[PDB]
Design a binder for this molecule. Structure first.
Ligand SMILES: NC(=O)c1ccc[n+]([C@@H]2O[C@H](COP(=O)([O-])OP(=O)(O)OC[C@H]3O[C@@H](n4cnc5c(N)ncnc54)[C@H](O)[C@@H]3O)[C@@H](O)[C@H]2O)c1
Ligand SMILES: NC(=O)c1ccc[n+]([C@@H]2O[C@H](COP(=O)([O-])OP(=O)(O)OC[C@H]3O[C@@H](n4cnc5c(N)ncnc54)[C@H](O)[C@@H]3O)[C@@H](O)[C@H]2O)c1
Ligand SMILES: [Tb+3]
Ligand SMILES: [Tb+3]
Lengths: 322, 322
């Protein structure tokens, strides 16, 4: 009996935005139909090298995926010539309990996060969305724009960056996709962008309520810890809200600040997967929609189960006896 | 950069009861000195194949060992020609966060469980213990007897089992250890066994309060789940109690019943590691001592780290790129 290992350097040549979209769109519908759930997250500051280490487990009864993503954040990894984020996904056989696969989760995390916002664009973007708005130009921004253009045909890409130095990262990605780009200010972005994808490590409201005008869908992907914030709580409180895990959205998600101040209800925080499964009308007659993407382990298990199938069909899945 | 893999079939040729004893003894001391700790345990009934699946993580700052054991219990694994207990230890580099090793955990679990019971024997057994009492003849009962005979020199082994046909497993291993065996009922076992080791999956009190007579150390290893029970809560109430994790002992351990009945309070539950680290005198003049072995992830981590060290020396550690 052997287990499969898919090295990190193989993920780029195997995964695609289409393959990432299929896995995440499917795992959203399973969570809505209560065929899949996330385990309680373990998150520990081990008190050594300032590390944050933990596990994100889950089980998908619809796709028979069982396992976890283990790892975290090592801020001092520069001395090792390594990136700060280090994670690994372990898959187990749901029928027997044996380990089945082990895949690096660094690039997979960026792809499933980009695929998550792409699902919210497919099911919540306004009719005939013209301009794509990008708030932030970090490492994740290139994956977010590529996943957005893969699911919706855009005509213009406008972008704003809290740090104007790396504004060129959005322009290179927009030119890569064959779309024009224009660096705009935050007030003009909310008025022209029909779809807005924010992906910053911000601790204060960036996109204000008076900025957003007209039908607009917002993919709030930045806030994933207690304390972070990207949107004006007044802006969150006028939009129909969808998320991946309601418990995480009201605690460490973008909605954490509006539910605490009593600006929105907890029972009004919808599930994006409920729209994919057809149980939720979706955008409906709301002018502004917000997808509060917080990140769940089932997203990491779905794309990991996809790369192991693509790897062994390609011939790059390492067979290991264990 | 790469990842090591130690197959399950190599564990037997690498681990010895003495090597497992030295690892677990040191881990008990590190926990008492607060140089190591266990992460919050995840334990989920996923609903598929009646399986119990979860993670037991931990970190040993003294030995710089980090990781978790993943897996659990598949009650119907006999139809797959597999044992019901399936687990796997994943070690991570504490300085970088990258995964370092994956080790088969089936044989490791039984070894460290037997080592934990042997540590309590070395530090809590009555002076000159001559008769070892085995309550349970399951799979792990053989490992418990071998580890107990390795740390302490016994003259006789008496055994009892709810299903009396399995007693051949105790007699066979008693023959391997050069020790005579006699099957008995629980009334004689409690009055003649100086050291008692219970390793049953029971939900009813077996060893009663008036069964135990004279100086006796009871290594209760079977109860690791809310609802299981091996001992009479009255017997637990009159004994000097030690455990590996006080939080688990009062909830899923043997003390869960004497705690709920108000017979004892959690501050009356000691730590076996404090006896190992010299901070606790241990037995003293008490007539009955109990070690509530529930199982902690650091035990798996310590015994797996030693296996990786031996596997690299013996040359049986598979180098895998990830
Ligand atoms: N929701 C998910 O599933 C998921 C997954 C991965 C990452 N993320 C989140 O995405 C966010 C960015 O990911 P990245 O890796 O692209 O980070 P990154 O640091 O590469 O980009 C940082 C962005 O945050 C902005 N920024 C930095 N400090 C700021 C401050 N003090 N105030 C306002 N803006 C500030 C920078 O201008 C830049 O745009 C992080 O917050 C991360 O947690 C979410
Ligand atoms: N504490 C630890 O660190 C640790 C580690 C591993 C296993 N365990 C526990 O050890 C126990 C047995 O381990 P095993 O894998 O050797 O199990 P096993 O099933 O091989 O043997 C189980 C024994 O329990 C007894 N038993 C079974 N059903 C019973 C019932 N209904 N009432 C009373 N007695 C009954 C029988 O004597 C049987 O031999 C399990 O409960 C397991 O959780 C503890
Ligand atoms: Tb059943
Ligand atoms: Tb028979």
């Amino acid at each position: 009996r052997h287990m499969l290992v898919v090295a990190e350097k193989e993920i780029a040549g195997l995964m695609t935005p289409e393959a990432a979209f299929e896995a995440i769109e499917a795992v959203f519908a399973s969570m809505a139909r209560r065929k899949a759930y996330n385990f309680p997250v373990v998150r520990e500051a081990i008190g050594h090298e300032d590390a944050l280490y933990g596990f994100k487990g889950g089980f998908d009864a619809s796709a028979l995926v069982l396992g976890l993503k283990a790892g975290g954040y090592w801020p001092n990894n520069q001395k090792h010539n390594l990136i700060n984020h280090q994670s690994t996904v372990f898959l187990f056989d749901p029928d027997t309990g044996r380990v089945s696969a082990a895949v690096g989760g660094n690039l997979l995390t960026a792809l499933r996060t980009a695929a998550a916002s792409a699902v919210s664009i497919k099911y919540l973007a306004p009719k005939g969305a013209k301009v794509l708005g990008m708030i932030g130009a970090g490492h994740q921004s290139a994956f977010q724009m590529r996943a957005a253009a893969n699911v919706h045909r855009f005509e213009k890409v406008i972008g704003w960056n809290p740090h104007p130095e790396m504004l060129s990262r959005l322009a290179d990605t927009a030119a890569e996709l064959g779309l024009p780009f224009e660096a705009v200010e935050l007030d003009r972005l909310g008025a022209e962008a029909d779809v807005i994808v924010s992906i910053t490590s911000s601790f204060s409201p960036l996109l204000m309520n008076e900025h957003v005008k007209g039908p607009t869908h917002i993919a709030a992907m930045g806030t994933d810890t207690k304390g972070k914030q990207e949107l004006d709580p007044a802006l969150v409180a006028r939009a129909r809200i969808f998320t991946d895990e309601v418990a995480q959205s009201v605690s460490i998600g973008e909605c954490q600040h509006a539910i605490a101040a009593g600006l929105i209800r907890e029972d009004q925080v919808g599930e994006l997967g409920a729209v994919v499964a057809g149980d939720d009308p979706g955008r409906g007659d709301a002018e502004v929609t917000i997808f509060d993407g917080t990140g769940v382990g089932l997203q990491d298990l779905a794309v990991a189960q996809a790369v192991v199938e693509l790897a062994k069909h390609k011939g790059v899945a390492q067979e290991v006896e264990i």
